[PDB]
Design a protein around this nucleic acid. Structure first.
Ligand SMILES: Nc1ncnc2c1ncn2[C@@H]1O[C@H](COP(=O)(O)OP(=O)(O)O)[C@@H](O)[C@H]1O
Ligand code: BEF
Lengths: 102, 110, 147, 88, 50, 76
DNA sequence: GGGAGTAATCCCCTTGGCGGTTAAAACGCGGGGGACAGCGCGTACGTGCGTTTAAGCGGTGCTAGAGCTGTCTACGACCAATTGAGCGGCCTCGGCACCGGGATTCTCCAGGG
DNA sequence: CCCTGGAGAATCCCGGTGCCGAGGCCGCTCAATTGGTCGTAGACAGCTCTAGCACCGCTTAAACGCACGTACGCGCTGTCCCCCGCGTTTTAACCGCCAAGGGGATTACTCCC
């Protein structure tokens, strides 16, 4: 199919069909059907690595959504590029002030 | 002992705990909590009691009420953090409406 | 979806066991008569032996209690179950107390047992245990949140 | 109903194969995929609106416009790899 | 990410040490006392409870 | 219903919010503002329930209202 | 001889209070952290200073990326079509769920020195 | 007073039991790129264009320091309000109870083949 020809894991034929149905502009270059798919796989792969190490931190083989929140909230860049989304099963990272605790 | 009991009662004893340490332990235990806290059934009761004003026969779904609960519950917590930081910025470790109004007028209510 | 979701249970075996009661009862209503005749003698014969354990128990077990305890003793020994039918007032609680005493004295096993009785009978069972076979260490259950 | 469940499982096995999943995480990752895609596409279209236009370069420059450079360099490299593989 | 990996590794080593020490404690406590089944002092405990 | 979020519920929400001491004249205004927010979101939800005059409200409607309200939410 | 609404059966499925509970919400207060009022202080800006000073002001000679045109070719729309990525019941077994077990240290009370 | 014992116990992690969960297996099933053309539009030269670069150099008005000098955030203090935790009390859903309809159909009846 399209994945073997492109040599990429995430399907791009369906993604390119969705982009064509989008019709965002008159000139839609079809030569890169997997560019957005490539960037999303890279982002999701680094997110998955962060979530995996977070889950292995607390002897949790299965990724609890709290681990996902911790993974997406422990990095300055990740919170900078999006910080206005409230994920299900919340809970901010632990914090304390120099005045509340001795 | 109110009545027949395992021998002599009153084992509870005067064991009052002073605040601060109790407050610290309860906030520490509450922070790790990640699931819903307020009762959902009164929430749906109130949201249906405040939906017929627009129109009746609107009907609802579990996904809907769940999403509104998630939206309201995950938004006021950041407000609580902002109010607490504005409070301990001044010499007021307790919360009063002054710093919450401060947070409202710095977070762009309009 | 509820009807289909519940329907994933089915029944596989005794639908064939019903066949011996269909038609003109086959040659199986007579077999049921013979089965009743056989089980009468089997129940009146097997393990009706008066082998009690009158130890650790306060008081005596009545004649009906004595004749009924052996049935439960056989059920335990023969690895069989049963349902006790009795008119209230004869003291099946005393039967249970005597059975527990028999298991405690005749055999070496005591074990943590479970009793499920209506809420207004918890204290009645407690004082029955206190009055008869008090050797057992009894635990109650009130105050679910803390106690 | 073409979802990304198979692709998500593939990327899971690629990154952390030993790690399992929840029953609602896949919805979160699918939302990440498609919402990032549509917002990036909308920014690209709004950027191309001014210039007269009636591909790889547009997507790459849209990525470099707003998305951080730390990720933008990797995005450009992987996009070049993908387009070269497609032309291969 | 490597800091998280080494933190996880040291957490695993501490968990393994706790496993070893608690398992040793449990094994020592298991073989120290086997007396609940004797059928002799049971009369004494029954009399005390009565 | 005015007393939906009751006093202990608001108290434990505040404790989850990391406050040392919570005074007894702070929950009224917080309740007022959250009721205003709830009225806004339900008004939007009923508006897009009549986008196709659908006779039911679902998660799509509320996520629409919240995503155009500026307070984006995730977990779905 | 043989099949389909009508009569009938199935098997819970409805219906609404209705007892009996165990989880929460709303009480009261001794003290007790928590907020608030007074007084000095000290330092560090507000200013009115004499003194340089750096963008303004006015005009210039172009010039280097910008505005801009054919145009023509690299390239964006193009519909057959087929087997493949994948999407859907299903069905198992251990990661997770929840609670007790006991050492370290967290922490506060009764002393020792 | 610092230090030691002495106990409730958080946390750790392990159990210990119950379950439901990712994905494979069977089924099939919808579209991506080949295969080509229609046109088209965006960069290759060509012309140009237009005010920006930097320049000229006084000239007030920012740079810019300093002594009077006092204003109030904060150091302490006293003065003193009501947050917070132990013991009680009043709602609240939920498991059932009860019994009269629920409803597609096919399998006696009778009308179709
Ligand atoms: N040995 C006894 N002495 C006095 N009362 C007895 C004795 N054995 C049984 N009972 C009575 O029998 C009652 C037991 O009731 P239960 O076991 O529920 O049904 P049943 O009435 O069939 O025994 C108790 O109320 C108890 O007072
Ligand atoms: F008749 Be009873 F209570 F067994």
């Amino acid at each position: 199919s399209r994945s073997a020809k492109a040599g990429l894991t995430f399907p791009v034929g369906r993604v390119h069909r969705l982009l064509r149905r989008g019709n965002y502009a008159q000139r839609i270059g079809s030569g890169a059907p997997v560019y957005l798919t490539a960037v999303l796989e890279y982002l999701a792969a680094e997110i998955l690595e962060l979530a995996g190490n977070a889950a292995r931190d607390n002897k949790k083989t299965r990724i609890i959504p709290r681990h996902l929140q911790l993974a997406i909230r422990n990095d300055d860049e990740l919170n900078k590029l999006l910080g206005n989304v409230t994920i299900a099963q919340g809970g901010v990272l632990p914090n304390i002030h120099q005045n509340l605790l001795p | 002992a109110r009545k027949s009991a395992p021998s002599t009662g009153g084992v509870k004893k005067p064991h009052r705990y002073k605040p601060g340490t109790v407050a610290l332990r309860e906030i520490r235990r509450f922070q790790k909590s990640t699931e819903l806290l307020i009762r959902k059934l009164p929430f749906q009761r109130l949201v249906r009691e405040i939906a017929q004003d627009f129109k009746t026969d609107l009907r609802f779904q579990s996904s809907a009420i769940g999403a509104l609960q998630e939206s309201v519950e995950a938004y006021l917590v950041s407000l609580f953090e902002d109010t607490n930081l504005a409070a301990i910025h001044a010499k007021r470790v307790t919360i009063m409406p002054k710093e919450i109004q401060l947070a409202r007028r710095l977070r762009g209510e309009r | 979806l509820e009807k289909d979701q519940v329907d994933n249970s089915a029944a596989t075996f005794e639908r064939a066991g019903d066949f011996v009661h269909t038609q003109n009862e086959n040659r199986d209503d007579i077999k049921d008569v013979e089965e009743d005749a056989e089980t009468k003698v089997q129940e009146e014969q097997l393990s009706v032996v008066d082998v009690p354990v009158p130890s650790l128990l306060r008081g005596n077990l009545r004649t009906y209690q004595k004749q009924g305890l052996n049935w439960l003793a056989s059920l335990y020994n023969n690895h069989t179950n049963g349902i006790l039918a009795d008119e209230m007032g004869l003291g099946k609680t005393i039967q249970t107390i005597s059975l527990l005493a028999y298991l405690a004295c005749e055999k070496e096993n005591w074990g943590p047992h479970l009793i499920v009785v209506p809420t207004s009978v918890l204290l009645n069972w407690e004082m029955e245990f206190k009055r008869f076979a008090p050797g057992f260490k009894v635990l109650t259950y009130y105050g679910s949140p803390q106690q | 109903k073409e979802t990304y469940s198979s692709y998500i499982y593939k990327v899971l096995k690629q990154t952390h194969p030993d790690t399992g999943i929840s029953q609602k995480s896949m919805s979160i990752l699918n939302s990440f995929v498609n919402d990032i895609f549509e917002r990036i596409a909308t920014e690209a279209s709004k950027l191309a609106a001014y210039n007269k236009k009636s591909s790889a370069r547009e997507i790459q420059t849209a990525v470099r416009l707003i998305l951080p450079g730390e990720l933008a360099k990797h995005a450009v490299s992987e996009g070049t790899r993908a387009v070269t593989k497609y032309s291969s | 990410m490597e800091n998280t990996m080494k933190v996880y590794e040291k957490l695993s080593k501490a968990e393994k040490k706790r496993k070893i020490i608690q398992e040793r404690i449990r094994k020592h406590k298991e073989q120290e006392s086997q007396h609940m089944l004797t059928q002799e002092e049971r009369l004494r405990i029954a009399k005390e409870t009565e | 219903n005015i007393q939906g979020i009751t006093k202990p519920a608001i108290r434990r929400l505040a404790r989850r919010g990391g406050v040392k001491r919570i005074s007894g004249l702070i929950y009224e205004e917080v309740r007022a503002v959250l009721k205003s927010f709830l009225e806004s979101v339900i008004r939007d939800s009923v508006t897009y329930t009549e986008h196709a005059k659908r006779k039911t409200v679902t998660s799509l409607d509320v996520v629409y209202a919240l995503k155009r309200q500026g307070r984006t939410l995730y977990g779905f």
